Write a protein that binds this ligand. Structure first.
Ligand SMILES: C=CCN(Cc1ccccc1C(=O)NCc1ccco1)Cc1ccc2c(c1C(=O)O)OC[C@H](CCC(=O)O)O2
Ligand SMILES: C=CCN(Cc1ccccc1C(=O)NCc1ccco1)Cc1ccc2c(c1C(=O)O)OC[C@H](CCC(=O)O)O2
Ligand SMILES: [Cl-]
Ligand SMILES: [Cl-]
Lengths: 149, 149
């Protein structure tokens, strides 16, 4: 549980927003990329795993599951690369709702930045700090620290 | 001190590596940028503060301290922007040794990536996972979780 992440790709403004969600906490990281290539996904995972103890990644689609560049990054960073099949149907709904929430936040901040990438990072900030009462940022640190101890 | 970070800028291959160091743990995040502008620094801080509870940042130089774009990011993200004067002379030596370590790691991985940005992210990974026994990644989570609790 502490090491499980899910990839998620959503679109806005003719660009791609790549998201990684820490499943147990709902904490996220995200980036804007021109398109979702194996190379972009691989680089994103490399960044993520240098920052958090990523044990397992559920890939967002079959192309990223198949990609030898993505597999190479998972090999490099010591990540178990897994599919993203929603054996629990609740997963679909959670990701859908998260994408809707994120796009809402991006709209609320969109005029505070020229570039979409800035707006996305503002949305990451708001999402991770929002008290649901703990925030996702508090939950991920608590979950991981408890695991360490 | 769970919320204190230090900016650090170093150069390699005619490019700039911008680093943020969590002072109490030695955990780092870093990026490769063409040059160290206020906009680049502002965006980097926005990213960092969406990911960790950044209370205070000691800027790496007077230009980033002065920059109204950097001040705007610090205002947006609720970060106290401070100078980076090494009132404790040990700070100087710690950052210099860190830059030397990072450059050493980048050399050890340099042939595993075409692009410097990849090698830098590999170096971040190795640095944060290295047991010195706990790793910097373990220490930052423990420090912050203890603070929350
Ligand atoms: C598929 C070719 C790419 N190479 C293959 C390569 C070339 C030369 C030597 C070793 C390798 C190798 O396979 N290394 C092991 C490995 C793969 C992933 C992690 O470790 C690795 C790579 C991936 C993503 C990137 C990269 C680079 C890079 O070569 O630097 O560059 C930045 C780019 C940014 C995002 C974007 O622009 O899409 O993402
Ligand atoms: C000084 C001009 C910068 N703008 C001013 C602006 C333009 C329009 C509306 C509001 C603002 C405003 O002041 N907003 C509050 C604020 C400032 C910093 C954080 O919040 C904000 C900005 C900064 C860094 C970036 C940006 C952008 C952007 O406009 O999107 O774009 C990506 C870029 C990438 C790194 C690189 O390429 O250097 O870093
Ligand atoms: Cl946070
Ligand atoms: Cl780590």
């Amino acid at each position: 549980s502490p090491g499980i992440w899910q990839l998620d790709c959503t679109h806005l403004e003719g660009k791609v927003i790549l998201v990684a969600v820490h499943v147990a906490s709902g904490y996220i990281e995200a980036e804007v990329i021109p398109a979702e290539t194996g190379q972009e996904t691989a680089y994103f995972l490399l960044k993520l795993a240098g920052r958090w103890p990523v044990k397992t990644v559920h890939t967002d689609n079959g192309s990223n599951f198949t990609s030898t560049t993505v597999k190479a990054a998972c090999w490099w960073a010591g990540i178990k690369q897994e599919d993203g099949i929603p054996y629990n149907p609740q997963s679909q709904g959670v990701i859908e709702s998260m994408n809707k929430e994120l796009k809402k936040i991006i709209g609320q901040v969109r005029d505070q930045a020229e570039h979409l990438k800035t707006a996305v990072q503002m949305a990451v900030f708001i999402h991770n700090h929002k008290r649901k009462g703990y925030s996702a940022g508090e939950r991920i640190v608590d979950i991981i620290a408890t695991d360490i101890q």
